Design a protein around this ligand. Structure first.
Ligand SMILES: *CCC(=O)N(c1ccc(O[C@@H]2CC[C@@H](N)C2)cc1)[C@@H](C)c1ccc(Cl)cc1
Length: 148
């Protein structure tokens, strides 16, 4: 799976990138596994996209949503879904939140909550069926990516 679960994953990942994990009992096992794998992918994508990223201006949540939709169209154009592509969604929201921290006009500290929202909406609406059919986060994602 439902929106709330995926929203919590997307928010936890933005708090990880922004170095502001929520004080308390901490993230779930699924969220901890995803943070590790998505960060590794994010570092590689930032290096590969360096020139592109140096000339982008993520000045608002609306612009971050437009850019996110454009990358997502190119990422899933062949219609296939797999777990690596789903990790790449999280890597792109991590890049967008870093850019918005630096370039947002009239910055708003709760902006990661709006970015998490549209990332969860995309994941639920476009990959939600595939995820449930492949075991969800607990019996699909975690089983594939948890430490050996
Ligand atoms: C610099 C180009 C650009 O502004 N954007 C962009 C287009 C396509 C990308 O595709 C990556 C590489 C191929 C796919 N596997 C994904 C990346 C970036 C826009 C649309 C954009 C810039 C920055 C961010 Cl973080 C998101 C989108």
């Amino acid at each position: 799976c439902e929106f709330g679960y995926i929203y919590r994953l997307a928010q936890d990942y933005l708090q990880c990138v922004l170095q502001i994990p929520q004080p308390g009992s901490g993230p779930s096992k699924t969220s901890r596994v995803l943070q590790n794998v998505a960060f590794s992918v994010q570092k590689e994508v930032e290096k590969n996209l360096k020139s592109c990223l140096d000339n982008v201006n993520v000045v608002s949540v609306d612009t971050a949503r437009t850019l996110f939709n454009q990358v997502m169209e190119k990422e899933f154009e062949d219609g296939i879904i797999n777990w690596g592509r789903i990790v790449t969604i999280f890597a792109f929201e991590g890049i967008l939140i870093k850019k918005l921290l630096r370039q947002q006009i009239a910055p708003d500290v709760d902006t990661y909550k709006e970015i998490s929202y549209f990332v969860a909406e995309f994941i639920m609406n476009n990959t939600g069926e595939w995820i449930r059919q492949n075991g969800g986060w607990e019996n699909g994602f975690v089983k594939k990516f948890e430490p050996k």
